[PDB]
Every structure is written in C-alpha cells, then in structure tokens.
Amino acid sequence: VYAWNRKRISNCVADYSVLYNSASFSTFKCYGVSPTKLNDLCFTNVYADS
Amino acid sequence: ALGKLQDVVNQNAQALNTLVKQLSSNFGAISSVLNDILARLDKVEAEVQ
Numbered sequence: 001v002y003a004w005n006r007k008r009i010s011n012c013v014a015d016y017s018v019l020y021n022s023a024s025f026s027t028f029k030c031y032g033v034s035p036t037k038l039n040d041l042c043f044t045n046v047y048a049d050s
Numbered sequence: 051a052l053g054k055l056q057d058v059v060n061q062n063a064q065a066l067n068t069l070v071k072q073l074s075s076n077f078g079a080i081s082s083v084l085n086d087i088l089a090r091l092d093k094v095e096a097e098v099q
Contacts, residue, residue, distance in 0.1 A: 032080060034092045041089065
C-alpha cells in the first residue's frame with residue numbers, strides 16, 4: 001500500500017456490471033457516480049489503483 | 051444624440067446576458083448541468099444536488 005499500483009484503462013468498452021454484480025466484493029462504494037449508471041456513461045481517462 | 055434610446059437597449063441586453071450566464075453557475079451542486087447529474091446519480095443522491 002505504500003507502493004500502490006496504477007493501471008491505465010483506455011480504447012475499450014467497460015461492462016462494469018461484470019464487476020458490481022460479483023458477490024466476491026466485500027466492499028463496493030462509489031463517489032460522484034452511482035454504479036447502476038456506469039453502463040451508459042463515457043470517460044476521458046480511467047485508472048485502477050490497486 | 052440617441053444615447054437615451056440606446057441605453058434602454060443596452061440595459062435590457064445586460065439583464066438577459068446576466069440571467070442566461072447564471073445557468074452555467076454551480077450554486078454548490080456537483081455540476082452546473084442538470085442532465086449530467088441525472089445521467090450520473092440515482093434519486094436519493096441526485097435530489098440533494
């Protein structure tokens with residue numbers, strides 16, 4: 001966590017429901033957007049910090 | 051000489067330019083644009099914005 005890893009995501013279609021429907025995730029909280037809505041949106045940049 | 055008539059046109063133009071530019075102001079919401087809020091949030095979160 002002191003050395004946290006960022007992946008850039010671009011030039012693709014993102015079905016976020018493949019993530020937010022998975023019962024594996026012990027936490028899934030969103031800010032400035034609702035996860036229910038992500039299937040219609042589009043974005044300049046996407047990052048995954050891990 | 052017609053400065054009296056032109057002043058009335060200028061004041062009415064400034065009144066509408068100010069009224070319309072104020073649609074772009076946030077007033078403390080997440081965004082100035084109403085369709086962006088509705089395309090991003092569900093009712094319980096959106097109604098506060």
